[model samples]
Target: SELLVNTKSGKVMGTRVPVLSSHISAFLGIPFAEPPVGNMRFRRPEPKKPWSGVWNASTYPNNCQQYVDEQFPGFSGSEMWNPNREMSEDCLYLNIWVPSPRPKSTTVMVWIYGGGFYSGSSTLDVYNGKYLAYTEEVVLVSLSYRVGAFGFLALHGSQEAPGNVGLLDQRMALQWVHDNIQFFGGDPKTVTIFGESAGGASVGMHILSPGSRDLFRRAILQSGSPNCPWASVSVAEGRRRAVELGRNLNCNLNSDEELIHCLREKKPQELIDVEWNVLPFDSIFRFSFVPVIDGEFFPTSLESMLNSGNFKKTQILLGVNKDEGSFFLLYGAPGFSKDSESKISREDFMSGVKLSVPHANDLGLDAVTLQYTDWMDDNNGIKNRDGLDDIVGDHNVICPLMHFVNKYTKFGNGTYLYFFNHRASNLVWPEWMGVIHGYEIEFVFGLPLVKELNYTAEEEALSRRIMHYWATFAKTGNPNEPHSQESKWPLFTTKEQKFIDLNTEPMKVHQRLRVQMCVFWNQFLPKLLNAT
Candidate 1:
């Protein structure tokens, strides 16, 4: 049967499709905001005006403009991750999946896609919400935000092109969900926002931002945090990148106003085509343009926010995957090796260490090298490749995430942590990439539960359990409540620092993962930041 839902914008006709035994009402490509074209470029997104007729929201929306490379290594990026839909500036649409027969006031689970804040869309098959929504009986939603220069290009004090519009776009979409989700049988007050990687960082940013307060009750951060160094650039750095982009196209104008105006005049693809030159050393920790901590949106540094308890007091569930850097090491040193099996020379590893932390002195560098070395090995420091992987993994993601967790648990309630250690049964990446960064996404969405994929029975059971925990967490602030027989996911506390390890059956709960490595990165490295 067809579904017609009314909102502030207007009525939208959606299709009801069968999922498992039940059906789900799916509304795809619903325009929440007007197209950010012409004068609207680089500005905060405006809410969509009320339309006269019913809009057919049956198809996926356009992806925001980005340089769609398989990211060099075709192992993970090629077909699965890259955008498949048409690219356009008019990309401010959202998709929703609600269970049919419509339960009264269903819990709403909103998703924000992640691609280092540069590349991603809601159209990815891995993100489809039908299974999760149908099984959990919750409304699942995903939104698209601008990327690259269009999203984060900062022009200080310039009315023409204020930075952080991408975040603003996300905020607007969230606002739309708050206002309109009730029409689709969703309880807006019980909304839970979840995402992986950059999307997780966005969830953290929303938690820290006063503007996004009261919009959602809980948040799920997988493999990302606002405190991650590469997740944000200073406003000055943002402006420099914006101007550099213009300068490459011969638009080196006098003032910020002139630069923005010139950028607006050029074609969208022209700006997208301008290469963001990544230095060899920055392969692991590089983003051309990402979120900027403008005063209004971010207010202050993440440290200041966390220290002063200056953020929304919502329940939090966040964690990282094991061997997160395995995915990036391929990108970090493409020429050195093609796969994870190849060993990186000690000299190359030291150079990378120096490049990652330029301010550290010789002793500090030696300390860091010693800390990361494989002491257990008979060959001593010969396992430099694994050492570099651990360093990149811990430094870039794990430590920063745990740092946020330590701070957030003090201010928020129902704080839980997880470690995704289960690799998919069918993986395009090599066997050595051990439960890498994004391998947990499909399982989280319960893709394996779908019959077509032909996943193992054990894999399906694991997905079911994971989804149960996630949906149960969304409904009630606890993952163990409402008759769940699975291992109880413990609260992350300063004293014990307990978390669930999602690996084989009967999922074990562990305490204080990678304590030494985390301490070195989270505590010791900061002391050595300026130490001689």
Candidate 2:
């Protein structure tokens, strides 16, 4: 059946969702705001112009300009792998998938994709919201925002250009949902903001941003946490990076007009190509163009904000994968060779700590790294060709996530943490990349095709169960629901803190892992008291 709907723009024709299908209706490429192009570039988002006639809502808009995939081979899959999606500066658009006929009530889930704040689009195949919308009877939405120098570059004297234009774009999309989602059969009040990796960090920042407090009711952060080094950069440092980028692009860094002019005049793909060479992915430091802790948009540091009870009255769910660094190490050159250990030394580890931590010293560095390495060995419970996996996992995902969850829980907010130990079949590099970063994305979105990677029917059922649990949390403040197979989730507390451990064997709440390492981090905190 054909249905007619009116957008803030003009009317649009859409097909009715197939009965019993995962989605009742799907609307794609809806513009939320006027494109940020030409004079609007680097300015705050403006309202989208209304259309006078019906427009097609069937295809996705061009993703924001991002680095080429050739630069980071890790992102080489799907049509999005192509750099051609880069188009007009006017890229403030969103897509929505909803169950047909409009349920009497529906919760909304707004997803922000992750790409180190430098690249990503809302149109990836893994992000298809059909299954989540149809099965859960909720509205699923995804949005696009600017990236790289154009989006995140901070300038010294240009008061017109504030950093975090990408984040501001996200805030505008949420506001659009709040104002017009009711017309699409979505409840503006019951909204959940969710993301993975970079997106996960964005959710964490959103929790602390005063401008975003009323935007959503709950948050689900996966695989990434707010405590990572890239979560917040200083304005001065951000400007320095931008200046370096300008010099590399052959622009006059001393002249603001020349820099902005050259940046705007260059083709988007040209910018992406240059970025790829300048910021090659490094296992120790894989991020560029990350969020900055300017006194404005993000007032205080995330840890301080959360600890001070500044987060809205929202339930929080945060978790990380078992082996995050394996994917990075495997995809990048030299790969995670059997001899990878030869490349690392105590000095190398200490230097890394000094670079990543604000005020790392000899005592604090040794205490933190030793405990973390020990935790990796104890919790993984597996011997491998080399211990490189253990080192990378501890530094990249395990330790950082623990710090994030613990800091937030200190506020006594309703927080539930989990550790995903379930292995997915089609890991990027080797089967040994067990439960790598992004392995759980398919399960969350209910992508059946991914099951062929390695799951049996029982495993598939468990995936579905997990999806339902996630959806329930998005709909209600709590992840628990009556008559569900999921065990009751307990709120994490300072004493005897519990975390849901999701593995193929038995999913249940278990005592927090690596207590000794957590204690080490706590003890090292005082040394960083003077750290900016």
Candidate 3:
């Protein structure tokens, strides 16, 4: 059946879809901004103008253009993350799922997809909000943003190609929700923005940005943070990369304006085709074009913002999976393999360490080597691989988030933290991979409960619990509210540093997540830089 809702842009006619016994209203592919094509490309998004008649929003939106390496047969890979629809520059659309017979004023949960700011789409099947919206009885929204060079290309001083339009795309989507979500029975004031990986970093950036801070009251960062080294580059480095991309594209003009103009005239896929991985180990974690400390979005550096307490204070729920590094190490790291039997040589481990901490001097290197070494198993490549996993996980995801928790909680914000310890049973990834990055998405979206994946009963229950926790947090600042039989999730603090361990049963709350590794990477390692 048809579901109609009026928005600022125009009347949007959505579709009513069945969940379980009940149905929910799904509004898909609603344009939040004007098509960013031709001259509009590489600039901030403009809000969609009011249309004359009702807009059809029944179909899924086109995902932003980016290179997706389709997975081959017999391979456990990233094919599941591919877009359901085609790719385009006119991809600034969003999807919403509302409970049928819509309630008076329900809390809204907005999702931002994560692909390292290089690739992602809000239209992915795993991100579908039907189950989440029906069970939790909350409005769910997901927004698509441009990715890769098309999204992050920065010509520092030029106004036409100011960088971080990707982030701006997200902000404009939030504005759309704020202005028009009420038509679908969403309470804009109680919005909670959550994302994974780069999307999580986007949430962190929103926390720091003056333009985005007012858009939401709560945020949940899953396995990413602005403090992560790969989240952004120095302003000079950003401009340098942009020019290098232009040089590669044969559009190396003298002036920034001319360079941008030439870039705009080129095909969208051409911008994405340019190789941005300059460093030998850039695949570990480096994007050719990523978010920059634009004077507009980010007034200052991420470090300065945290140190000076210049960012917004919001109720936050931040978490990281148990094996955040396994994903990267399995596929991206040098000398690593996808299967469990494969091992990383000692020399390869050393090379990985060196590449990970490029600026580490002899003393720092020795310290790192000593910290991660399994002295008892000196010759075991598996043990060395374990050490490398800790290095990548800590430096890239876990440590940065813990560091943010330390700084963010100092402001007395109600910060709840969790550690996802369970891995989906059906994942084709090797058992040794553990709960790797992005595995939590299925459970978070309640896919196990809805989809016929043959998930264990315990796992389905766990997914239901996680969905409840998320919805409860969105409804009230405290996730512990709407009490259930499950153990209470505690607020994170610099002193206690408590976090809930999410799994099947016997819920455990632990303290000081990776205290040793985080202290070494976030605290001690920095001081080593100043050493003689």
Candidate 4:
């Protein structure tokens, strides 16, 4: 079965996918732009020309040549393999999953995969759109863009390229959806952009990006925000990392012409191998190719833009798991123990804080750690305060995210924050890895348990409720309306700081924590700004 879809280039025929015995019209690997390779590398994404023939989107294109799978090893499970297809420079493609029986008007949810800024794909099993599309009666769109050095590197003498090409590619995809989604029985006026981790951060960035202003009406940020360290790095620092990679590849960074030429000439695997050696950690904070505060695409800092009312009209659902950093510590940095004081030296931690915020007090850091340790011990029944597991988790992940919510909420945007406190049984680490990063994805999609992790009847019910809330928020500006048997979610305000606390017993809205740790961080922000 086939259906006609009109794209900016021209009208084309797309194949229908077989779903649960019904034929759902499907499209994959549709080009949103002429690839960002060759001269286009590191430059802004260009729009694709209208095509006259039926563009076959039956198969997924090879992911961008980055290190998502390699960085995390077994992260992709059994689907890890290098595709035999040539890794092309022109890889700006998108896929669409629409309902078999087309709805009169459907909401569109765009998926942005996360692998820091260097890796991830739209074709991952976890991101499958069949259930989301058919069950929710919405259209799902997923796309692939440039990643790593090719996607977010700002090197010396490369002023022409600027930075944030990956983001630019995302904007282009949204434009494609706006111009063409109606052909697939989707409503162009109502679109939600959502993703996890780096993809979530990308959604956050789009909240501040001027180019992306009219593209999306709502956003869902899962476990990542634009205010993180990865979002605020300097161009000089990006160049330094690029230079380090150049040295590993034996390319001369001093010669811009040679550097770009050599990098472009390097084989995809060769580039990947070199990048792995230089930045051993995952792409998020690895000091390699990260989102740059370039004056063009990204423009001003996300903090300033958000504070300046950039996203006042957009609605956002921002949330994090109870242990956002547990997976990273377990799989990426195994040395960090739950019972040990952060392996991070006190001096080093203070120094890093100083780099991010002027006048960062060592004493303040000490106080914050102590306060968190006390709170975790009292609330979680931890009698043995072994190491600073909770301390490190909060200091690095939780606190910063809370600060993000506060900042955005303070700016008068419709912001709703939630805390995921449930623990999964098949956790990669101990039971203490409570609701770790990426754990919410499976639950949000209501996917089957991966291992010994089982969702009870109640948990399954809650998961379905969350999926409706998410899909509804994506389709519209509000997640308050119940698509299932859940209480009415109050809009978050500074006074109420309303939040949905997701736990095993029962999910309910609660007052924001009265803890002073985040308060202390907020108090220091003004002082830090004054010092700067």
The best candidate by TM-score is: 3
Instruction: Summing lDDT over every window of 10 consecutive residues in candidate 4, give the lowest-scoring window.
Output: 379-388
Model 1 Cα shift for residue 465 (angstroms): 0.8
lDDT for each residue of candidate 1 in 1-532, tens digit (9 for 90 to 100): 3389889889998988777877788999999899999878998889898998889988888989887875555545456788879999999999999887877798999899888887888999899899999998899999889988888888768866778889989999999999999999989999999988899999999999999988899999999999997788777877778888888888857988778888889898788777465212345656788888878888998899999999988788889998887766666653234444655676677776775554467888888888877656624333676677777788888998989999998888779999988877777676666677877889989899878788889899888888888898899877777565645788898889999888657767789878888999889878876564
lDDT of each: 0.83, 0.69, 0.85, 0.67
What does candidate 3 score on TM? 0.96
Query: What would the TM-scores of all predictions be?
Result: 0.95, 0.86, 0.96, 0.84
Arrange candidates, best TM-score first: 3, 1, 2, 4
Error of 2 at 21 (Å): 5.3
Worst 10 residues of 3 by lDDT: 275-284
Sorted on lDDT, best first, the list reads: 3, 1, 2, 4
Off by over 4 Å in 2: 16-23, 71-88, 276-283, 331-387, 426-428, 449-455, 483-486, 521-532
After TM-score superposition, the amount by which residue 125's alpha carbon in candidate 3 deviates from its true location, in angstroms, is 1.1
Give candidate 1 misplaced runs (Cα > 4 Å).
Answer: 71-77, 278-281, 334-340, 354-364, 375-382, 482-484
| Model 2 per-residue lDDT tens digits across residues 1-532 | 3345686666765554443323378888888888888766666677787887776777777877676555434444333334345465666789888777775558999999887778777887778777778777888899877877667777645754667878888898999889878778889898899998888988878887899989888999997776676555777877776666777788876676777777777776666666634442233445557677887887776667767877665688878777766655554424243223324444444444444343455665555556445444533323331244544555556667777777677764578888888775443445656676776887788774343456566667767776777888888777789776656877777676788876556667777755654454444555554354
User: Which residue pairs collide, candidate 2?
Assistant: 17-24, 24-100, 35-90
Candidate 4 regions off by >4 Å?
11-13, 18-23, 68-90, 156-160, 276-287, 332-392, 425-430, 449-455, 482-485, 513-515, 520-532
Clashes of each: 0, 3, 0, 5
- Candidate 4 achieves a global lDDT of 0.67
Q: Residue 15 lDDT in model 4?
A: 71
Residues 340-398, candidate 4: write the lDDT tens digits: 44344443333333332322356554554444443434333232222234443444456
